[PDB]
Coordinates of N, CA and C in Angstrom, one line a residue:
Chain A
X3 N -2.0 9.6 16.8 CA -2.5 11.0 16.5 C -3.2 11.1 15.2
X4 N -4.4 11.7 15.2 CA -5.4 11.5 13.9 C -4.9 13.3 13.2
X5 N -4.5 12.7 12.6 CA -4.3 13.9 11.0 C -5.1 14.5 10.1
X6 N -4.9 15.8 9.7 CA -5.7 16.8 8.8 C -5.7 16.0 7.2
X7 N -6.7 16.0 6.4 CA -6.7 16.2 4.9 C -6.2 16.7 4.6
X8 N -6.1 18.4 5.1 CA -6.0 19.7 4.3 C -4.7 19.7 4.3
X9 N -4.0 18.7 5.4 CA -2.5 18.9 5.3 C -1.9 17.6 4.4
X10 N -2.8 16.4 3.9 CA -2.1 15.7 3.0 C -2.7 16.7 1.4
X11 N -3.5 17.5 1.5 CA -3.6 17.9 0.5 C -2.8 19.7 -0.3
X12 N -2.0 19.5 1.0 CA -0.5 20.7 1.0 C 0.6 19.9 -0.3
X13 N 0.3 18.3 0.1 CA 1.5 17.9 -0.3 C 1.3 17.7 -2.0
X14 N 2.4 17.3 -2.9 CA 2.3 17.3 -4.1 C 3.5 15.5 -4.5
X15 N 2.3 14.5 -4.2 CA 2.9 13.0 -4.8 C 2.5 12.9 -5.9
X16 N 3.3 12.5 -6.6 CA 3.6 12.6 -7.8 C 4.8 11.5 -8.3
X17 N 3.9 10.6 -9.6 CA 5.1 9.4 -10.2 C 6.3 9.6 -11.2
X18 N 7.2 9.4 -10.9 CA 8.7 9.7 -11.7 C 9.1 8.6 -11.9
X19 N 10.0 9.0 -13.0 CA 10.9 7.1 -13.7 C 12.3 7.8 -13.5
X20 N 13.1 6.7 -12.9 CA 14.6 7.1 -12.5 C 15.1 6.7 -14.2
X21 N 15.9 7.8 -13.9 CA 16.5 7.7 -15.0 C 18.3 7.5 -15.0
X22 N 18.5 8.0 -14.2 CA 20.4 7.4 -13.4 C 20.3 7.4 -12.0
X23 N 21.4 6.7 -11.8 CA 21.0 6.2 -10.2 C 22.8 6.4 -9.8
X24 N 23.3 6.2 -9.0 CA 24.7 6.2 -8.9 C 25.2 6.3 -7.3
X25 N 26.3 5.5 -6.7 CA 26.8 5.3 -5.4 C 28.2 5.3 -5.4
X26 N 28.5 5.8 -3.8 CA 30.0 6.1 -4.1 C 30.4 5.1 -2.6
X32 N 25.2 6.5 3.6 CA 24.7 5.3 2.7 C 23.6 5.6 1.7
X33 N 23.9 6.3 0.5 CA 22.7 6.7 -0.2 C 22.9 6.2 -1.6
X34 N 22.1 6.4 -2.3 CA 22.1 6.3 -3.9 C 21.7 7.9 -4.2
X35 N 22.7 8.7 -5.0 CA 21.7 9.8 -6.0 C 21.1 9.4 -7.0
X36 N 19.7 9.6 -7.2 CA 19.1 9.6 -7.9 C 18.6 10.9 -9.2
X37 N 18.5 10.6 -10.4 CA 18.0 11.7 -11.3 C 16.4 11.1 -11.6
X38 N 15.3 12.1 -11.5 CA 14.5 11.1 -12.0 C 13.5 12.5 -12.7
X39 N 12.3 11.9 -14.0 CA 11.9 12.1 -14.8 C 10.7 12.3 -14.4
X40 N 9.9 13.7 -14.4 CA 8.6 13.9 -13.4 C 7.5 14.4 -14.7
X41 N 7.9 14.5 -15.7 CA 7.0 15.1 -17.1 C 7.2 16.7 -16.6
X42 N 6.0 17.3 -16.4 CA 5.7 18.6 -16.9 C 6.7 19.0 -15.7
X43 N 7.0 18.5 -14.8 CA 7.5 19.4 -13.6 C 9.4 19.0 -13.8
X44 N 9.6 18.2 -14.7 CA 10.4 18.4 -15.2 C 11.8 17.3 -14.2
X45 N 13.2 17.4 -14.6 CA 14.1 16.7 -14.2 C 14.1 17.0 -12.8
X46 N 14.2 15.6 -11.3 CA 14.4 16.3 -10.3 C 15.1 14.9 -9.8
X47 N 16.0 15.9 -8.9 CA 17.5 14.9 -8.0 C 16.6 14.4 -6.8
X48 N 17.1 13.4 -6.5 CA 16.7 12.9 -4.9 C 18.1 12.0 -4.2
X49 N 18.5 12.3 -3.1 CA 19.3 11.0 -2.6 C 17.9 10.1 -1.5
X50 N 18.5 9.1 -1.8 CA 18.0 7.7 -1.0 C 18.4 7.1 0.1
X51 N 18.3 6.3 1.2 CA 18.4 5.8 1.8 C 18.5 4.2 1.2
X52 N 18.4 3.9 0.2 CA 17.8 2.4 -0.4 C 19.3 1.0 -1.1
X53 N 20.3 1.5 -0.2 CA 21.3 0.4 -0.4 C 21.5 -0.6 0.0
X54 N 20.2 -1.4 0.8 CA 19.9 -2.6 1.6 C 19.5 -3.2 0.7
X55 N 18.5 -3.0 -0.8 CA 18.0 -3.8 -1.3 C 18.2 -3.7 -2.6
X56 N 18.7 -2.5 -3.3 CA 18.8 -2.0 -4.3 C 20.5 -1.7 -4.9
X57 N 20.4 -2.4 -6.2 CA 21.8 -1.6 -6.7 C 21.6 -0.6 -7.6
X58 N 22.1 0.6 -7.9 CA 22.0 1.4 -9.2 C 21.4 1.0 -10.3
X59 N 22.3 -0.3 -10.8 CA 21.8 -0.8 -11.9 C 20.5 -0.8 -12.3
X60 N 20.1 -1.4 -11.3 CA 18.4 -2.1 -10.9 C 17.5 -1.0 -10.9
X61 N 17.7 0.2 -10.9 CA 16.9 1.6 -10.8 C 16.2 1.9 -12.1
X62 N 17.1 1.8 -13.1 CA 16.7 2.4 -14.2 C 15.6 2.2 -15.4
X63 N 14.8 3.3 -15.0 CA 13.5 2.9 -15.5 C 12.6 2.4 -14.8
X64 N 12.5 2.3 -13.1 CA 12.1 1.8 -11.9 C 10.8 3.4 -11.7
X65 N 9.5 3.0 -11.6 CA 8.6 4.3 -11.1 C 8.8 4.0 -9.9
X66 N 8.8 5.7 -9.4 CA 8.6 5.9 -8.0 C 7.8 6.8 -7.5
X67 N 7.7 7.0 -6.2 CA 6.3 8.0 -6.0 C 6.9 9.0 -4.8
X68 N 6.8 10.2 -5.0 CA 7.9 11.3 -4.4 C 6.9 12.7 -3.9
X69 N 7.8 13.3 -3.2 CA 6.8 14.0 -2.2 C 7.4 15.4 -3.3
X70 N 7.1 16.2 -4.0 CA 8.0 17.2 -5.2 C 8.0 18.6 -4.2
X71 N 7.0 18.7 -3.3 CA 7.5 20.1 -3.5 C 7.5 20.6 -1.9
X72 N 8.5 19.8 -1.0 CA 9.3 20.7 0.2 C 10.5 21.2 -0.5
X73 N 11.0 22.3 0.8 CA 12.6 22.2 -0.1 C 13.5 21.5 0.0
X74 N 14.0 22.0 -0.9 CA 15.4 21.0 -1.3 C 16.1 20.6 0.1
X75 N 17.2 19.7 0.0 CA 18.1 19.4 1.4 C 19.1 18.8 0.4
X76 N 20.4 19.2 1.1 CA 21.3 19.0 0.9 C 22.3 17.6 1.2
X77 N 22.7 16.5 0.9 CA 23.1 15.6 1.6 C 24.4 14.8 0.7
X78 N 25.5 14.7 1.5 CA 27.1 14.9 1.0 C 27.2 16.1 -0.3
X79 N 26.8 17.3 0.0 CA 26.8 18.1 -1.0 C 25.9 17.9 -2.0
X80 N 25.4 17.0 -2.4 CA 24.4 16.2 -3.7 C 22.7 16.9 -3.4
X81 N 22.2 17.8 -4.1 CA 21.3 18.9 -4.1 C 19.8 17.8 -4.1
X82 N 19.1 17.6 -2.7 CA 18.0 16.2 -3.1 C 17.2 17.3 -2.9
X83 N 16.4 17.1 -3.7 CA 14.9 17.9 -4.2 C 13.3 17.2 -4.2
X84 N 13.4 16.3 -4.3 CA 11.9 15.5 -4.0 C 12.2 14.0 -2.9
X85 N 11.6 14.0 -2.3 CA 11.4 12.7 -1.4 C 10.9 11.4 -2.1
X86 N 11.4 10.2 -2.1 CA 11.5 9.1 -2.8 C 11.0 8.4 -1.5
X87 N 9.6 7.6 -1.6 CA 8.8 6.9 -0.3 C 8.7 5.8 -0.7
X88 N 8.7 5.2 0.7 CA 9.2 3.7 0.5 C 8.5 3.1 2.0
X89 N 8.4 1.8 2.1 CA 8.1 1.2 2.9 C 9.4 0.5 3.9
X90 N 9.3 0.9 5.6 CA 10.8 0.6 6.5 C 10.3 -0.8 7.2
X91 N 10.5 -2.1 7.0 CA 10.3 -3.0 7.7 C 10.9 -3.1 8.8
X92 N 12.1 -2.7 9.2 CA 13.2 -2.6 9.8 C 14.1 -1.5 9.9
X93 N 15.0 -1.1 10.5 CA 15.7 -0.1 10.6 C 17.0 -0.4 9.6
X94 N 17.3 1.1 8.9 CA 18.2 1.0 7.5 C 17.7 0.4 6.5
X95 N 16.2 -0.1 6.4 CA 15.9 -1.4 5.0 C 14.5 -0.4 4.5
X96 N 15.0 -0.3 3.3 CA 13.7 0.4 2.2 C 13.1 -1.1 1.3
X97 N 11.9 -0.7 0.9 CA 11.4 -1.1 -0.2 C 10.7 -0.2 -1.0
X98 N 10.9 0.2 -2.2 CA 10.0 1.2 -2.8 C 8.7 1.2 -3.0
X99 N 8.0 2.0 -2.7 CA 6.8 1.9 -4.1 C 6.8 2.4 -4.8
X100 N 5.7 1.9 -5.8 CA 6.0 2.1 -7.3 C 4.6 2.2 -7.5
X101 N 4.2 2.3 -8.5 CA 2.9 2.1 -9.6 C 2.4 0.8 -9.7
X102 N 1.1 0.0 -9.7 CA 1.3 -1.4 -10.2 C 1.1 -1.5 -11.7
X103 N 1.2 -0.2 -12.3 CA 1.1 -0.1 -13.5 C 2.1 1.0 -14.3
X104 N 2.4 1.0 -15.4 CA 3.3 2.0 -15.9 C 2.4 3.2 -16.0
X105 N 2.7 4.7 -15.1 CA 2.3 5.3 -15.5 C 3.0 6.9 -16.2
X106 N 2.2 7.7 -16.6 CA 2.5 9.0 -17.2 C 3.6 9.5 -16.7
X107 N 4.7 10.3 -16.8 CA 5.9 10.8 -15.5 C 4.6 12.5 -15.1
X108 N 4.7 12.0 -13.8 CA 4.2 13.3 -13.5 C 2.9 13.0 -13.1
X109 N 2.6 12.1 -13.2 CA 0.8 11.5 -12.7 C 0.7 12.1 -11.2
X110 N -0.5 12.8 -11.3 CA -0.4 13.2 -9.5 C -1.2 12.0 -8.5
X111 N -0.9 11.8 -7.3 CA -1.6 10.5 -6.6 C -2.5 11.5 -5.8
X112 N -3.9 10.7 -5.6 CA -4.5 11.0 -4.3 C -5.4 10.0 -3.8
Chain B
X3 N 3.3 26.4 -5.0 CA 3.0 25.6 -3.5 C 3.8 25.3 -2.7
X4 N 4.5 25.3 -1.7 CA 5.7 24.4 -0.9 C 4.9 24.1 0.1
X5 N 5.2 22.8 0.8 CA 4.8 22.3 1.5 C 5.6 22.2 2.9
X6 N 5.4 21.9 4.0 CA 6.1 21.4 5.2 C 6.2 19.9 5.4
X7 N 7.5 20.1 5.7 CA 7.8 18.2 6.2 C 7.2 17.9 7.1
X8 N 7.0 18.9 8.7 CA 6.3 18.5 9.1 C 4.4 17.8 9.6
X9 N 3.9 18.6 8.4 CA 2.9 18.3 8.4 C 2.8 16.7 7.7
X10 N 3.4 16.6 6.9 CA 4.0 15.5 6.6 C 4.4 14.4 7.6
X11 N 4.9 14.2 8.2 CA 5.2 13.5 9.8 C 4.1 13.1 10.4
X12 N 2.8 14.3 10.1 CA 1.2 13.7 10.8 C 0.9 12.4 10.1
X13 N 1.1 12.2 9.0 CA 0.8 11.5 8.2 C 1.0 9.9 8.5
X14 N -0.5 8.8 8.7 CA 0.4 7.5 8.9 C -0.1 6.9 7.4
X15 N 1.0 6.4 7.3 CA 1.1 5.7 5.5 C 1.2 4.1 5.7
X16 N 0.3 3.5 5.5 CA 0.7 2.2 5.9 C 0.6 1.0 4.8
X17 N 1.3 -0.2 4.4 CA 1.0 -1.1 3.5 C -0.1 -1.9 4.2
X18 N -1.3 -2.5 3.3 CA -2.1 -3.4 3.9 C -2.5 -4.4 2.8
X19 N -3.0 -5.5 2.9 CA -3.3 -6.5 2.0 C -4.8 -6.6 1.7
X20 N -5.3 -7.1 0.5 CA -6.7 -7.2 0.1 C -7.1 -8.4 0.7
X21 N -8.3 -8.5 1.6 CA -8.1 -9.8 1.7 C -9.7 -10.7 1.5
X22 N -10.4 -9.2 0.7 CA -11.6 -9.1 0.3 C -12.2 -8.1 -0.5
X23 N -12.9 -8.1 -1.4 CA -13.3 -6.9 -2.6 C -14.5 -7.3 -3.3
X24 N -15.5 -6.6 -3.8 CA -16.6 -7.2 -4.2 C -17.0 -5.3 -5.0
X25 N -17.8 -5.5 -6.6 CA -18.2 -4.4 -6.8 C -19.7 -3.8 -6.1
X26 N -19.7 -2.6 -6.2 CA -20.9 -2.2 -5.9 C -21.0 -0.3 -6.1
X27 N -22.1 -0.3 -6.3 CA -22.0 1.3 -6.6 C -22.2 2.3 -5.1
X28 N -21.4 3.6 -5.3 CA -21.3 4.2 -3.8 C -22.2 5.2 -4.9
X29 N -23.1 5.7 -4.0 CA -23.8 6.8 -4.4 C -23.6 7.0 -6.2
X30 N -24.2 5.7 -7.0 CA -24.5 5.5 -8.3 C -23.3 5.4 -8.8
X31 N -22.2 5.2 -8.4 CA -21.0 5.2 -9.2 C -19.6 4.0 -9.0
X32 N -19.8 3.1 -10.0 CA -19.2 2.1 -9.7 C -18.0 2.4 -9.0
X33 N -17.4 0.9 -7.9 CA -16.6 0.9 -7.1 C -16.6 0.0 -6.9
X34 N -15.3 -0.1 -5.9 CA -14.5 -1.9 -5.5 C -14.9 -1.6 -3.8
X35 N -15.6 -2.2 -3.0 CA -15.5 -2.3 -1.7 C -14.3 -3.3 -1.3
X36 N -13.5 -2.8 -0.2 CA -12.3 -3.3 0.1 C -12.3 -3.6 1.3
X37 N -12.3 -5.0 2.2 CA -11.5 -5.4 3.3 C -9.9 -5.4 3.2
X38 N -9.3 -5.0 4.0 CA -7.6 -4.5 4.0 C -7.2 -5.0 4.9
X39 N -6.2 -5.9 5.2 CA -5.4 -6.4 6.5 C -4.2 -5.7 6.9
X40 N -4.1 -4.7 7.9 CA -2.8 -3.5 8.0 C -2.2 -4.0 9.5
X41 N -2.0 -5.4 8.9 CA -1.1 -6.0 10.2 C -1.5 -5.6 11.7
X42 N -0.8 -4.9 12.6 CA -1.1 -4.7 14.2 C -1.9 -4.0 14.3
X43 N -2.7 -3.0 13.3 CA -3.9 -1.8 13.1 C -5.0 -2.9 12.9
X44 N -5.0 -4.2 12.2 CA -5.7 -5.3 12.1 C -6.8 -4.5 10.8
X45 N -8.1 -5.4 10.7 CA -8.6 -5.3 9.3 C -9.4 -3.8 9.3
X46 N -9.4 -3.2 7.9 CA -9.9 -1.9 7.9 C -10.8 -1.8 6.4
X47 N -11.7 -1.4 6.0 CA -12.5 -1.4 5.0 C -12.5 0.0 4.3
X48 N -12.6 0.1 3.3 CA -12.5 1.3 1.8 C -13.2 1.1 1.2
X49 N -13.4 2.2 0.1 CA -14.0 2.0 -0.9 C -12.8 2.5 -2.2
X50 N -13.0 2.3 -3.2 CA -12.4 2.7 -4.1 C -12.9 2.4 -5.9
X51 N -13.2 3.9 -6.3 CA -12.8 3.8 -7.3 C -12.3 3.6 -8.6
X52 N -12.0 1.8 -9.1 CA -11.1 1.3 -9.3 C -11.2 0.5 -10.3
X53 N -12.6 0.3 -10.9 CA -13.5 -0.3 -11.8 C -12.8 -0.6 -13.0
X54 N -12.2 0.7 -13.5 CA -11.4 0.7 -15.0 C -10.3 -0.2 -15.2
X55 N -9.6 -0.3 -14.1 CA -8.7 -0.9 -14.5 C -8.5 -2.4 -13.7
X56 N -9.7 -2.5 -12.5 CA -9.0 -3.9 -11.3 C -10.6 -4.4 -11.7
X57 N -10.5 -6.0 -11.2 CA -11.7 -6.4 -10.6 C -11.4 -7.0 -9.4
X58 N -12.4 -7.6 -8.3 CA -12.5 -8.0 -7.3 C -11.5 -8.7 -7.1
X59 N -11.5 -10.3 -8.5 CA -10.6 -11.4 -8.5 C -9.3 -10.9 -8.3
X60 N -8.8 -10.2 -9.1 CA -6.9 -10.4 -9.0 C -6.5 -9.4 -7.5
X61 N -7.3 -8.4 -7.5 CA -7.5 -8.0 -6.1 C -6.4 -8.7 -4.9
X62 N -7.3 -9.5 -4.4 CA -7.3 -10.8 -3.6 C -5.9 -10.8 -3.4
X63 N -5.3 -10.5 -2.4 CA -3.9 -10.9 -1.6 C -2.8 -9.7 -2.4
X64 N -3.3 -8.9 -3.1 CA -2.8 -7.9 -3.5 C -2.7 -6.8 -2.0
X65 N -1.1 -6.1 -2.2 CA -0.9 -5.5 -1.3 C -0.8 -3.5 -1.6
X66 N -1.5 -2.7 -1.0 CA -1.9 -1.3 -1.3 C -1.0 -0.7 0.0
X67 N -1.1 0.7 -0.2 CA -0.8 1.7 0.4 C -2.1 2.6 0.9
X68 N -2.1 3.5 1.8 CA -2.9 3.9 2.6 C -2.7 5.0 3.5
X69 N -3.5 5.8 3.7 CA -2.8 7.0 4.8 C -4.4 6.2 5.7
X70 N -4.6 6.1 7.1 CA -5.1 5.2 8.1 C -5.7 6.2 9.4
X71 N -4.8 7.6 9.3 CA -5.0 8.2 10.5 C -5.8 9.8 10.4
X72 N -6.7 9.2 9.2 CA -7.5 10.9 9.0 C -8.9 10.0 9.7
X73 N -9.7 11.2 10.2 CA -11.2 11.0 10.2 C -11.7 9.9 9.2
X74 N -12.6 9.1 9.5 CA -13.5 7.9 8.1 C -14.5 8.9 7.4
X75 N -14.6 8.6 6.2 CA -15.1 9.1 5.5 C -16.5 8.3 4.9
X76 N -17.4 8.8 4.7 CA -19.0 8.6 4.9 C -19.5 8.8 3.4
X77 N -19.9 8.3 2.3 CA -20.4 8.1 1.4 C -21.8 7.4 1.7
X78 N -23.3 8.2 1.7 CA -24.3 7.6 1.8 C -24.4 6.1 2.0
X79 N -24.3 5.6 3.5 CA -23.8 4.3 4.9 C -22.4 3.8 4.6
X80 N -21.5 4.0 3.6 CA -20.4 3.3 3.3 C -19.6 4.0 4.1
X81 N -18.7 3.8 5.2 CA -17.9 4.3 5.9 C -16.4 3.7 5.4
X82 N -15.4 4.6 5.1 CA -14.0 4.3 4.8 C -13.3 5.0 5.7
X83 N -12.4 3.6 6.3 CA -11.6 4.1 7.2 C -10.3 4.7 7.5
X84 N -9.8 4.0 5.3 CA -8.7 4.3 5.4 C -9.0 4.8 3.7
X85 N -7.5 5.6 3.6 CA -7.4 6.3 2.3 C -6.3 5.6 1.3
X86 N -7.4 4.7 0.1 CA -6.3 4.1 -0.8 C -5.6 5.1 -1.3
X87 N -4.2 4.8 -1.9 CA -3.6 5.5 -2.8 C -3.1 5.1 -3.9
X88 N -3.8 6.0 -5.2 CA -3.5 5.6 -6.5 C -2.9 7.0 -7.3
X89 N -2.7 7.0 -8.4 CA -1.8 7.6 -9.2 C -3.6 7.6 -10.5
X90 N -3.9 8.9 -10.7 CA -4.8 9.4 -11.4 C -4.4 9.9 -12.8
X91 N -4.0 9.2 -13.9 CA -3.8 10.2 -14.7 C -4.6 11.0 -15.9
X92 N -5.9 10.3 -15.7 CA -7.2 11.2 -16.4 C -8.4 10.9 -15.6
X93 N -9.3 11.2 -15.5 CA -10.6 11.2 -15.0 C -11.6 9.9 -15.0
X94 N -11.6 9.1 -14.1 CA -12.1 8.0 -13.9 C -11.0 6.7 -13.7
X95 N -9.9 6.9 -14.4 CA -8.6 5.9 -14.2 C -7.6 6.3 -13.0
X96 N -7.7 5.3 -12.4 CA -7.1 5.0 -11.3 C -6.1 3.8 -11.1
X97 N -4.8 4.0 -11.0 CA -3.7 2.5 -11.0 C -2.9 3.0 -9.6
X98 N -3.1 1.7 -8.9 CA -2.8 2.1 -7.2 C -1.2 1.6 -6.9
X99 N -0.8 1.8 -6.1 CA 0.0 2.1 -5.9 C 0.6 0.8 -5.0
X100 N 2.2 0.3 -4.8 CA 1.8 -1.0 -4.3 C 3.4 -1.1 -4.1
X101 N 3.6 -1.5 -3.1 CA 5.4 -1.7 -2.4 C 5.6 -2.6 -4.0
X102 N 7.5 -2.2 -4.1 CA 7.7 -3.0 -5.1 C 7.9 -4.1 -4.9
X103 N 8.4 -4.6 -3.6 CA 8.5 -6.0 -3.0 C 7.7 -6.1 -2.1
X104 N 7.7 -7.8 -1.3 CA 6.8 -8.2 -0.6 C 7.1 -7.3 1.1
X105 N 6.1 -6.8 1.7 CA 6.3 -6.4 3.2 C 5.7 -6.5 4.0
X106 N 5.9 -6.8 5.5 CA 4.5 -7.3 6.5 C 3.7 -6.6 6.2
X107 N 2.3 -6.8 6.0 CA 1.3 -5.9 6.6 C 1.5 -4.7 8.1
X108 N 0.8 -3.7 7.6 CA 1.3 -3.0 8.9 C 3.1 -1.7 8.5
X109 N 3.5 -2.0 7.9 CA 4.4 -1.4 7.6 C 4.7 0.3 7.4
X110 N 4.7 0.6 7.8 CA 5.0 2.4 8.0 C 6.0 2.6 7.0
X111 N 5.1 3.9 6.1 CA 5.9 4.2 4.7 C 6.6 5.9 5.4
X112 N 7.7 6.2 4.8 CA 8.4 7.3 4.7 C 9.3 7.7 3.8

């Protein structure tokens, strides 16, 4: 099915740097957007990823649906990634370090 | 602004591979012409604005992102089929966007 512009141009992607990550299947994430400021996300990304490994990791996030709620933990921007398989993330990132807050189009 | 997820959902986002690039200007204004390999969608051609920071060479087997399922876009004969995605953070600079690990071609982003 062939898709509108005007509706990827609703959306608001935008690059952030994780700044804590933490697991207790998701990871919470805190991550660093510049002007639009501190925003939570949970993940699906425990197939490839440990906490550790996050920090300081750019990612590219969808900022402005609303929020959802998931084990109580308040996720507020969408963290996109590439599904080779079912339950398996890979992130994207930047191929370069950029600004927090960079908008993509 | 708030957006809908499901407009979002229209959206196909796919990883594809460079597997050809060469400069040339689109309507006077430097650019990277791009052959792309998007796995079972098979090869798809772009253009992109990308001068500042890439050239053709390192290009080459580099793997991008893409939305694949809008109308092609028409720049005086250059027809782009698919839409790179980069991260803009001033005017004329462009740094694209790129799985952090390796993934088939073809891969559907969410």
């Amino acid at each position: 099915a062939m898709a509108n512009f005007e509706d990827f141009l609703t959306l608001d992607l935008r690059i952030g740097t994780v700044t804590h990550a933490e697991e207790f299947p998701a990871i919470r994430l805190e991550i660093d957007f510049g002007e639009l400021g501190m925003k939570q996300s949970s993940a699906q990304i425990t197939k490839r990823y440990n906490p550790e490994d996050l920090i300081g990791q750019q990612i590219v996030a969808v900022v402005n649906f609303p929020p959802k709620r998931v084990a109580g933990f308040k996720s507020e921007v969408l963290v996109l990634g590439g599904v080779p398989e079912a339950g398996d993330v890979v992130l994207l990132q930047p191929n370069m370090e950029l600004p927090n807050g960079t908008k993509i189009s």
